[PDB]
Design a binder for this molecule. Sequence first.
Ligand SMILES: C[S@@+](CC[C@H](N)C(=O)[O-])C[C@H]1O[C@@H](n2cnc3c(N)ncnc32)[C@H](O)[C@@H]1O
Ligand SMILES: C[S@@+](CC[C@H](N)C(=O)[O-])C[C@H]1O[C@@H](n2cnc3c(N)ncnc32)[C@H](O)[C@@H]1O
Lengths: 219, 219
Amino acid sequence: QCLLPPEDSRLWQYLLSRSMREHPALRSLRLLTLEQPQGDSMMTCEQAQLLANLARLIQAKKALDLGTFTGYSALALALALPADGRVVTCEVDAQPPELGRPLWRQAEAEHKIDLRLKPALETLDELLAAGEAGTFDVAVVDADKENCSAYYERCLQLLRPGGILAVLRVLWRGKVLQPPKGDVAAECVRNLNERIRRDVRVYISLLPLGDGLTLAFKI
Amino acid sequence: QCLLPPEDSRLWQYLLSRSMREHPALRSLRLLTLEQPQGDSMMTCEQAQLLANLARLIQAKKALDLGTFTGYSALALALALPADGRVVTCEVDAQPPELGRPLWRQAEAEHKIDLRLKPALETLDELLAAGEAGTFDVAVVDADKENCSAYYERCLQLLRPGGILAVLRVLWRGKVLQPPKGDVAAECVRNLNERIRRDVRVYISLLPLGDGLTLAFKI
Ligand SMILES: C[S@@+](CC[C@H](N)C(=O)[O-])C[C@H]1O[C@@H](n2cnc3c(N)ncnc32)[C@H](O)[C@@H]1O
Ligand SMILES: C[S@@+](CC[C@H](N)C(=O)[O-])C[C@H]1O[C@@H](n2cnc3c(N)ncnc32)[C@H](O)[C@@H]1O
């Protein structure tokens, strides 16, 4: 079900303590988020830092974040971007982003975070119909699993060559090994993994962080 | 001791099968190396692939590979570079590179791989004396632990801004937690981790691959 030990593992704690450089506002947002219903679905701190580091590495200016929740990944990305950077973040529930907004403000990153409260598929299609193919530097796919294939295809088209497409929670607690009959979400995660496996448009790494992290680098 | 389950476990095999894209020669090099005593000293295939992927991502042209062994990481890196790319690979033991060379040839990568048969510290000093500071794109530190702090510093100097410095085996089978008395290598690993943790010259991720993998991105 899970490749890594419990969070309380001493070796895991050492990994975190010897690597984490979490912004105070980001840290405050995480601790708040963990008290919320579905707080355990949030992006983990070391995943967010890896993605922010990669965004910084490639000098990203334009990021796309699917599944805002409380805005943890959006804020992590925003902090990796220069002053004129923008994160377009997509969500359907208005409540969770409003929990994170005060922390976006504290981090002086609220102006960098562009919240689009509508289904992600709608925002993706709009961006493309506006002719914004090949303009995004980083895309994070962490919304619903039902539409994740459509999300992957659209994010890939929105990324420039050399862009980074991250898909979160790709092992689905080990259910990808044999998705239960009628488990739409699990079948969807499994189907996308197969597609990405075959995709010659990208080169890829699958990492044992969180519930599995795919990094697909666009050619 | 380990953050990860055994390599042959079901979920790990899934992660590999859904991500791995070794060039046939690179695959053959791995399999051949694994027929040798201590063959599993080679870095795992997904670590080499992550490193090769990040090299490609940043359009690397020059790489440093400390601890050639049979040439697995050297070849992985070479395959991520353009025709005129170069990997300076450093090794003290003449025998293992002889094993890998036929696979370097099979991969059309011999002209890209620059083998320096002598202590890595000597090669690093030579490159710096030659005016190569700030010109390498990727540096992989996978030799002896006794000199790993010296390797880190020299590699950091040799890397350009935006370069990637990878340190392998940073958890040292959990001995970093409390290095046993007289365990000089474990103390060396522990000491470097504290320096990197504090190091303002880089931004960092520590990943639960192999025996721990540190990625330090140069500012
Ligand atoms: C796993 S959470 C995202 C975690 C978040 N990225 C973080 O950093 O903590 C999944 C989010 O996707 C949202 N979501 C579900 N369907 C969506 C859709 N069609 N479009 C956009 N967001 C959606 C959920 O409401 C939820 O907040
Ligand atoms: C863990 S193996 C490297 C594995 C290789 N990176 C791979 O991916 O397959 C460590 C290597 O460092 C070499 N080594 C030991 N001391 C060295 C030194 N002072 N300079 C260069 N290489 C050294 C060893 O002989 C050994 O081949």
